[PDB]
């Protein structure tokens, strides 16, 4: 690509060619056109999956959930025109997004009825049916997660950043565990690095060592960050990464901070959190060898809203690790209350 | 940084904030006039007779600063002169390092007079000062000395011993199916066709420092004998530095001044894969010294398209590509090894 950068101290610009990585997090994904491979092809795939024993879909990210919402109406119509008693119901996402063991098949032949493009305006709405193919929702009772397909799409062409482009997708022929690399951007330049995708923005810096600076996650996905898109992948243990490997955290020395281990029991239930190294408001942390051992993460205020004042850690480093959600500040696993017992506090009940 | 960019293939434009790596393939501030002089003086009385440049950046710095440096040395009455020459590739390492002076020269802020004592910066002077008495990699970019909108780089004499290249001028990035490893002299591109592989490289210098692993993609599970650009020539220790069927090119034409690695045949040539071809060795040029063009080459188990180097003086071939019938004793050979 060709592009220009701006400095606003002295109003001028610097232009050239190269590779540009943009901050695409916290941008609305509702303003694109989605093209799962073909209406008849997708209908045949869903039909064959239902006949095999696969009940529904578990979503890798929120982009896939929005794609299914955009598709479901035409998909149900075209399924109806072929005389199949099956309807697709799309729900909402909650974190963390657990992964499933099944995969969505690639049919030999498409269904021999219906139109040949997405977006055909005007269709007779289909009627409800006894059989439901539930895309992820609050419906883990008619069929559990051990019968749901996961990570069965590949992005072939996209225009993210331009609000009226098409996204082209196809159903893959293989089983996989890594995240889709078409939407990943990693870049370092000098003393700053970024690991990013459509829902992650992870920053690093060069102090005495390379370390994690701050992160911003609007989803908790459980695929694996590809090693082709990671900086400094060797010589690092999986038990030192701040963001767990099972939460699509990069396997990098850039994903580390001195004095902390992996945060398997952080507040991963929240819809959106932001990782900082700074004390929660009205709180102080002291480094003492008499403190307790690390456990589940604790919220700074109690269930009634009272702010705890004193916490301790054994061998951690200032500033302390914290999480920022809608509820408020949480603390890392290594930081425990000083005086008030932990039975009075709200603690995380989710493990990675 | 905040900016805008366009993709001409699709005619789509966008703006925002992020990290941008530009293709670049500069009024330096060598420490201080009164302190670099003291460092050079102490080094000369320490037994160091010269400097071996790490890159062309340092050579241009020395060539710009030499006049004022000589003026400072003469005004302080120190019997020493600084002579800077050109750059010959590859740029080999030196075992010494410049000292950090405790105090600056008392005098300083007209030309100078040539003396009998020479502190020879990189040049064609290996007899007066052999490589085993020359300093190397003795400078570091300051904390904010480099940036997108600087056009003036601040350097200072380093206090430690190191082997890696300066990380302040390195930019590497990957976006989708295109990746780049780059600095002020290298521009190394890779792609994903079936696997990740080297696509093309453009080099305007051959350094011998080490590419740091903090600025490298996919550093694990890679053998040092598979890298197309040798690790000894500041090639990244990455799977992005590999191409199927080829090993490390230790005997390529690294004597050039500006190289360009690409995978396609030299003009008017044809390569076939045969199990009855000669073994690998030094790289051979496509045109003989008399101007005649060889036209039929072989490789044993290489992969099409073939590896080729594009210098201003011809089109060389990878170490695995040998002449089929025409004897290679009359062809041109590379005289350097990484």
């Amino acid at each position, epitope marked *: 690509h060709h592009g220009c950068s701006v400095d606003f101290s002295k109003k001028e610009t610097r232009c050239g060619t190269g590779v540009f990585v943009y901050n695409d997090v916290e941008a609305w994904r509702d303003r694109y056109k989605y093209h799962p491979d073909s209406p008849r092809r997708l209908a045949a795939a869903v039909k064959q999956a239902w006949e095999d024993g696969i009940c529904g879909i578990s979503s890798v990210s929120r982009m896939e959930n929005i794609m299914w919402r955009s598709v479901e109406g035409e998909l149900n119509a075209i399924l109806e025109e072929n005389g199949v008693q099956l309807t697709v119901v799309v729900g909402s996402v909650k974190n963390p997004m657990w992964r499933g063991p099944q995969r969505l098949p690639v049919p030999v032949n498409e269904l021999p009825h219906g139109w040949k493009a997405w977006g055909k305006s005007y269709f007779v709405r289909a009627a409800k049916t006894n059989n439901s193919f539930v895309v992820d929702g609050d419906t883990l009772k008619e069929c559990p997660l051990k019968h749901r397909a996961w990570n069965s799409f590949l992005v072939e062409d996209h225009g993210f950043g331009v609000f009226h482009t098409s996204v082209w997708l196809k159903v893959r022929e293989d089983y996989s565990l890594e995240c889709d690399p078409a939407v990943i951007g990693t870049a370092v330049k000098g003393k700053e690095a970024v690991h990013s995708d459509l829902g992650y923005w992870i920053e690093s810096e060069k102090n005495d*060592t390379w370390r994690l600076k701050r992160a911003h996650l609007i989803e908790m996905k459980t695929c694996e960050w590809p090693k082709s898109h990671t900086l400094w992948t060797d*010589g690092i243990e999986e038990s030192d990464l701040i963001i767990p490997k099972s939460l699509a955290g990069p396997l990098s020395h850039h994903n580390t901070r001195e004095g902390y281990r992996t945060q398997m029991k952080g507040p991963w239930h929240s819809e959106e959190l932001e990782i900082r190294f700074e004390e929660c408001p009205g709180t102080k942390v002291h480094v003492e060898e008499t403190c307790g051992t690390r456990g589940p993460s604790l919220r700074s205020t109690t269930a009634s809203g009272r702010v705890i004042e004193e916490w301790c850690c054994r061998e951690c*480093t200032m500033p302390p690790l914290s999480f920022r959600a809608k509820d408020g500040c949480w603390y890392g696993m290594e930081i425990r209350p000083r005086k008030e017992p932990e039975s009075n506090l709200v603690r995380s009940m989710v493990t990675a | 940084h905040h900016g805008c960019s366009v993709d001409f293939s699709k005619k789509e434009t966008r703006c925002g904030t992020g990290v941008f790596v530009y293709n670049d393939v500069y009024k330096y501030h060598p420490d201080s006039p009164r302190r670099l002089a003291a460092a050079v003086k102490q080094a000369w009385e320490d*037994g160091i007779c010269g400097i071996s440049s790490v890159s062309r950046m340092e050579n241009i710095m020395w060539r710009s600063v030499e006049g004022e440096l000589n003026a400072i040395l003469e005004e302080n009455g120190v019997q020493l002169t600084v002579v800077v020459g050109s750059v010959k590739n590859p740029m080999w390492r030196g*075992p*010494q390092r410049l000292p950090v002076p405790v105090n600056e020269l008392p005098h300083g802020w007209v030309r100078a007079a040539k003396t009998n004592n020479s502190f020879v910066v990189d040049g064609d002077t290996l007899k007066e000062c052999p*490589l*085993k008495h020359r300093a190397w990699n003795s400078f570091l970019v300051e904390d904010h000395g480099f940036g997108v909108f600087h056009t003036s780089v601040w350097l200072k004499v380093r206090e430690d*011993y190191s*082997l890696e290249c300066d990380p302040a001028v390195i930019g590497t990035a990957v976006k989708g199916k295109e990746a780049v490893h780059s600095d002020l002299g290298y521009w190394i591109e890779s792609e994903k066709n079936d696997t990740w592989r080297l696509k093309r490289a453009h080099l305007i210098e051959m350094k011998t420092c080490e590419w740091p692993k903090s600025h490298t993609l996919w550093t694990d599970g890679i053998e040092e004998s598979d890298l197309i650009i040798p690790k000894s020539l500041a090639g990244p220790l990455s799977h992005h530095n590999t191409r199927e069927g080829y090993r490390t090119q230790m005997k390529g034409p690294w004597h050039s001044e500006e190289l360009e690695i690409r995978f396609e045949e030299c003009p008017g040539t044809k390569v076939h894969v045969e199990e009855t071809c000669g073994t690998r060795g030094p790289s051979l040029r496509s045109t003989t010294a008399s101007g005649r063009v060889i036209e039929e080459w072989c490789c044993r188990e290489c992969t099409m398209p073939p590896l080729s180097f594009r210098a201003k003086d011809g089109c060389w071939y990878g170490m695995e590509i040998r002449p089929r019938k025409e004897p290679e004793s009359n062809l041109v050979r590379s005289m350097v090894t990484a």
Partner: antibody
Framework: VQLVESGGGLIQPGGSLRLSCAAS????????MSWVRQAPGKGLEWVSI???????YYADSVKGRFTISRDISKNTLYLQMNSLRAEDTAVYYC???????????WGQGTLVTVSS | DIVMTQSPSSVSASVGDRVTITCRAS??????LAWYQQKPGKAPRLLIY???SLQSGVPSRFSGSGSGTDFTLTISSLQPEDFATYYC?????????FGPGTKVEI
């Protein structure tokens, strides 16, 4: 500058051990720190190195078993030794790299015995 | 790997005599060589680096020379404090390898 090596004793084969090196007069994050061992009656052997930037390299004999690391706050160098064998018994030194790519400052040594 | 060989295995000399020890490499490690001194019960000490440069604080009665594959360490006036074991090690590429060793007797 000073280098003092502490945590080496007796261990049974197949066991693990952790060595330490305390530095005085300089910061560990500014030098190339290395481990060298000398078998009783034999010569010297280079084990592993850590760069000032944090890069690590190993000899093929101990490639997957030993691990070198640092602690900036404590200003100490470590070596984690796992799945020890008979040929791992020696005196382990703590050395640093400087001009010529050679070792200038050595420790006082620490002996490790692997026997049942 | 680069294998380094040393000769002689042992040598004996009296006070004030000239001593010569030779190191031999198996590849082109040119001018990237160092020489050490090992006393029994002590850590090694660096004497020469870059095949000719004298480490600071070492007496000048030691001298080095060589390039390429062959190298030589010379003591001019032997002293009673200079009876120890001496090694050469290459500094050209990883892994770094030392020499078998040479003992100076009497």
């Amino acid at each position: 500058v000073q280098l003092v090596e502490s945590g080496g004793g007796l261990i049974q084969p197949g066991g693990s051990l952790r060595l330490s090196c305390a530095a005085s007069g300089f910061t560990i994050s500014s030098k190339y720190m290395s481990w060298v061992r000398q078998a009783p009656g034999k010569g010297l052997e280079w084990v592993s190195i850590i760069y000032s930037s944090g890069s690590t390299y190993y000899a093929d004999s101990v490639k997957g078993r030993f691990t070198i690391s640092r602690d900036i706050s404590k200003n100490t160098l470590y070596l984690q030794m796992n799945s020890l064998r008979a040929e791992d018994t020696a005196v382990y030194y703590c050395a640093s790299l400087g001009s010529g790519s050679a070792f200038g400052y050595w420790g006082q040594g620490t002996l490790v015995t692997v026997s049942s | 790997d680069i294998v380094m060989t040393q000769s002689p295995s042992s040598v004996s000399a009296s006070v004030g005599d000239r001593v010569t020890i030779t190191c031999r490499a198996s590849q082109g490690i040119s001018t990237w060589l160092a020489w050490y001194q090992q006393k029994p019960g002590k850590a090694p000490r660096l004497l020469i680096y870059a095949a000719s440069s004298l480490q600071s604080g070492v007496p000048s009665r030691f001298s080095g020379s060589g390039s390429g594959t062959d190298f030589t360490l010379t003591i001019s006036s032997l002293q009673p404090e200079d009876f120890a074991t001496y090694y050469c090690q290459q500094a050209n590429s990883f892994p770094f390898t030392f020499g078998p060793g040479t003992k100076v007797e009497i």
